[PDB]
Amino acid sequence: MLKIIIPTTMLLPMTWMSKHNMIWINATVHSLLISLISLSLLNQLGENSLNFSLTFFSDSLSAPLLVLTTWLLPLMLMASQSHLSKETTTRKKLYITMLILLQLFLIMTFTATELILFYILFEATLVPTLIIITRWGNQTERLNAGLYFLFYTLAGSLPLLVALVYIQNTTGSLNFLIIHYWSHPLSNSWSNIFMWLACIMAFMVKMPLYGLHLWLPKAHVEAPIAGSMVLAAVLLKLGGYGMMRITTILNPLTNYMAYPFLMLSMWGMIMTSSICLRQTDLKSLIAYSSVSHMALVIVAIMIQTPWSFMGATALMIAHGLTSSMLFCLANTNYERVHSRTMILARGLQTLLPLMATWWLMASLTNLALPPSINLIGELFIITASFSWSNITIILMGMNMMITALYSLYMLITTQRGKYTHHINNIKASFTRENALMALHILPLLLLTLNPKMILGPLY
Amino acid sequence: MNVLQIVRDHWVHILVPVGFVFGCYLDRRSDEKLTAFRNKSLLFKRELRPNEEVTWK
Amino acid sequence: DSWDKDVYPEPPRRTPAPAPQTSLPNPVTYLTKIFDLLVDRPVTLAREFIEQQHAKNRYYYYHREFRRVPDITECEEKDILCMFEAEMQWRRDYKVDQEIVNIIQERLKACQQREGESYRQNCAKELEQFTQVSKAFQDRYSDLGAHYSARKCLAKQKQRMLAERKAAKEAAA
Amino acid sequence: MMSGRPGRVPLQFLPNEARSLPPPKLTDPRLVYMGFLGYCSGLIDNAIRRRPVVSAGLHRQLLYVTSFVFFGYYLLKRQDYMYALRDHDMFAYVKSHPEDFPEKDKKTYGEILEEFHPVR
Amino acid sequence: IRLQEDPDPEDENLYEKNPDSHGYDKDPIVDLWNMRVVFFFGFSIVLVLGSTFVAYLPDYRMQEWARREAERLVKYREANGLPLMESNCFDPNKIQLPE
Ligand SMILES: CCCCCCCCCCCCCCCCCC(=O)O[C@@H](COC(=O)CCCCCCCCCCCCCCC)COP(=O)(O)OC[C@H](O)CO
């Protein structure tokens, strides 16, 4: 509720009014402090969601994502204070302002009690990210990249706007509790499909499914490090949160209309993971891997099965923490080599031995190696999907088989092998990069002991 | 000890902490308007104790 | 004992008396013996020390009880005030029934190792009890959807005697 | 739409009978946000003129907060008036038109036949 | 010369100015202090107590309360001999099924 919001927004005057060089320090202090307070919100009751007021409420689904976003907030500050050191204090302050303003919106939307209120800051997250990708992005095609990312989501979000207000004029309020209790069987009338399509496509776009995913490779690669993590670790997941919330009034229409997306997602994950097997760009390879994992959640959410929701929430968080880490891996390597081609800097393990380890559990976590939370996600989803149909395991398991090859492919090409002779600027890794990397992996294994925290309201 | 300057450069550190203690205040103020069914739901409604007058604040 | 024997029926253990005839010493007696005065007694000595300390300052806690509240079949249409109590009561009974299946599942799994090679026929009672529970559990909550609600559970149920009474009419002929 | 209701004297920002409503409390959360807007203008006001933003012309942005608060306050009373007015003649209408507002029958969920769709 | 620009700056090594550099910022004293913040306010106060806080969090989802009720409920049910959990949930005796 408020105990998270005002501390987040009151953090903004601090960064603006802090000393010239202390900006990174005091921002990091209370961002971690905010994370601690958010963790206090992680508690949930049995069945009734933790409701605070007409404006804000939390459930067993929102809380794990809330603590994840606040937990993220220190990490971009940690990950960004290397390529922004040679910048004017105002621009550094502006950069920090963008992140916490972005993070502030995330707390708002996840705790939003009204769908329209959920909707207003659903796209409002775009404005800070658009600035981050465009201004501080370090590339040339970032301009076209920002346009692709911006227009795709709007093209899907605006139908939701017309759909959402239609609910208000037809079924009174759009309070999440009032929708759930007063749910009615959506008919099969040919208007209700376009009703169904509008209420779904908005979350489809910013949850890249095959076909509606070309923004993500352009979104991730040209975005700066902080932009890439926030976009891949939370931003691809507003779509996820919407579906678990909005599919309450899409049944039984979801039963019949689910087919085109399920085939698109299940086949897409094989295709996308195949792209990972032959990606020339390390950041792009990680980006395409996010599509495969996210497309798995598409099948998870859209099956509408108790087990499927549970594994979704497991992959909901685990992928986000993992994808942020892998982007950190690529970023921590990038500036040393000043290039994105994977084969540019081979045999890094012989030069940097600890990064060899950090890359190693990172690849293992993305492998869904048990008992990592990723395995709990994928394995739960497979069982739910298998109950839905026996055939899907052929597609399901094949993804894990492909996921194995490309995951260690980056490991062998970069970490193992012969070091590149020509390069000589690879310095011993700063303990900031090392500290940040453990900041990611350590909570992941810490979460393994308590899956019930992140299983969700279906748990 | 330089306090005229440690205050100037480290007065920012108190902003968020008071924000949190402020955040609890509206949290513990907004709930008052939400009293309505206080000790009214038959699941939890029960006999009011000799001294305390409000079951849940 | 902490738990209840009625909830967890434990058939009495049949432990044969040790009657060996070979003169050479049986070793496992000795390893149990040395273990007794090397591990078991020191563990017990610490345990009796901690347990007496626990009883020195004993603090209590009880088990929360929710009284019965009108459920969804008598709650008025719309009227989310009565729906709230109805939904929460039904979800609480969902938790109990999930634990009821859990209790039966442990008893079924308890038979396996307990009966050893006799598992196939000895606890067919355990098998049918789980069969009765699982089938009845299916009629209660199965296929309710990830957004299951007491309304849907009533809706799914209302189909059951709808078909049943229709079958009864056909059966009567 | 209230464009021609009986009694609307034109060019009257706050009609007298609106005084029968609870006035907005001096620290109404809507009001302080209106005060926020005044301040936010002040900071940028020094920005265009290239002044030390926050500590630049304490008089200037101080007036901004005062002006926005008052213009906000009278706006809120007027805003509260229409919503009260919109609800008032609303209720007066439905009693005057009982036939167009039938009282829907009281049936519990037990008798309602809501078909069930399995998820399979 | 196309435009009057500047050559691309060379990436400075924080180590060759100060060997103990931690990569958090250039100035050594704040860099050492940034170490203290990122670890003390990172691993120390969040990971350690936060884990204990969430680990020792009170009953979440009523995972044990339902068990105790189930044990009592199942102990009641087989004592009388009626089936230990009915196939029906909302008692059909009240239900007023149409026709
Ligand atoms: C880039 C293109 C879009 C990307 C994909 C987005 C999703 C695809 C479908 C988009 C649908 C947008 C319009 C839906 C608004 C809400 C729909 C709704 O609530 O359902 C209504 C569905 O009714 C409609 O007619 C909705 C619109 C149907 C689709 C036709 C217009 C939308 C498609 C063309 C415009 C957008 C495409 C891009 C054009 C450049 C119910 O009203 P009804 O017809 O049942 O009303 C009662 C009675 O029958 C008479 O009204």
UniProtKB/TrEMBL annotation, chain B:
Keyword Zinc-finger: no
Keywords, in A-Z order: Electron transport, Membrane, Mitochondrion, Mitochondrion inner membrane, Respiratory chain, Transmembrane, Transmembrane helix, Transport
GO cellular-component term (any): mitochondrial inner membrane
Membrane-spanning segments: 10-26
Membrane topology listed for this record: Single-pass membrane protein
Subcellular location: Mitochondrion inner membrane
Family recorded in the similarity comment: Belongs to the complex I NDUFB1 subunit family.
Subunit-level organization: Complex I is composed of 45 different subunits.
Protein's job: Accessory subunit of the mitochondrial membrane respiratory chain NADH dehydrogenase (Complex I) that is believed not to be involved in catalysis. Complex I functions in the transfer of electrons from NADH to the respiratory chain. The immediate electron acceptor for the enzyme is believed to be ubiquinone.
Protein name: NADH dehydrogenase [ubiquinone] 1 beta subcomplex subunit 1
TrEMBL record, chain C:
Bias (Basic and acidic residues): 2-13
Transport listed as a keyword: yes
A Gene Ontology cellular-component term: respiratory chain complex I
Transmembrane listed as a keyword: no
Disulfide bonds: 75-82, 111-123
Annotated keywords: Electron transport, Membrane, Mitochondrion, Mitochondrion inner membrane, Respiratory chain, Transport
Annotated spans, Disordered: 1-24
Lipid bilayer topology: Peripheral membrane protein
Subcellular location: Mitochondrion inner membrane
Similarity-based family: Belongs to the complex I NDUFB10 subunit family.
Function: Accessory subunit that is involved in the functional assembly of the mitochondrial respiratory chain complex I. Complex I has an NADH dehydrogenase activity with ubiquinone as an immediate electron acceptor and mediates the transfer of electrons from NADH to the respiratory chain.
Protein's UniProt name: NADH dehydrogenase [ubiquinone] 1 beta subcomplex subunit 10
Organism of derivation: Sus scrofa
Residues shown, of full length: 126 to 298 of 299
UniProtKB/TrEMBL annotation, chain D:
Residues annotated as transmembrane: 60-76
Main localization category: mitochondrion
Source organism: Sus scrofa (Pig)
Keywords (A to Z) from UniProt: Electron transport, Membrane, Mitochondrion, Mitochondrion inner membrane, Respiratory chain, Transmembrane, Transmembrane helix, Transport, Ubiquinone
Cellular localization per UniProt: Mitochondrion inner membrane
Protein name: NADH dehydrogenase [ubiquinone] 1 subunit C2
Keyword Hydrolase carried by entry: no
GO biological process: mitochondrial electron transport, NADH to ubiquinone; mitochondrial respiratory chain complex I assembly
Protein family per UniProt: Belongs to the complex I NDUFC2 subunit family.
Membrane topology category: Single-pass membrane protein
Any one GO CC term of the record: respiratory chain complex I
Described purpose of this protein according to its UniProt entry: Accessory subunit of the mitochondrial membrane respiratory chain NADH dehydrogenase (Complex I), that is believed not to be involved in catalysis. Complex I functions in the transfer of electrons from NADH to the respiratory chain. The immediate electron acceptor for the enzyme is believed to be ubiquinone.
Entry annotated with the keyword Nucleotide-binding: no
From TrEMBL, chain E:
GO cellular component, one term: mitochondrial inner membrane
Keywords of this entry: Electron transport, Membrane, Mitochondrion, Mitochondrion inner membrane, Respiratory chain, Signal, Transit peptide, Transmembrane, Transmembrane helix, Transport
Membrane topology: Single-pass membrane protein
Main location: mitochondrion
Membrane spanning stretches: 37-58
Span list, region Disordered: 1-22
Places the protein is found: Mitochondrion inner membrane
Domain of life the protein comes from: Eukaryota
UniProt key word Ligase: no
Subunit structure: Complex I is composed of 45 different subunits. Interacts with BCAP31.
Function (record text): Accessory subunit of the mitochondrial membrane respiratory chain NADH dehydrogenase (Complex I), that is believed not to be involved in catalysis. Complex I functions in the transfer of electrons from NADH to the respiratory chain. The immediate electron acceptor for the enzyme is believed to be ubiquinone.
Family of the protein in this entry: Belongs to the complex I NDUFB11 subunit family.
Stated name of the protein: NADH dehydrogenase [ubiquinone] 1 beta subcomplex subunit 11, mitochondrial
Name of encoding gene: NDUFB11
Parent-protein residues present: 53 to 151 of 154
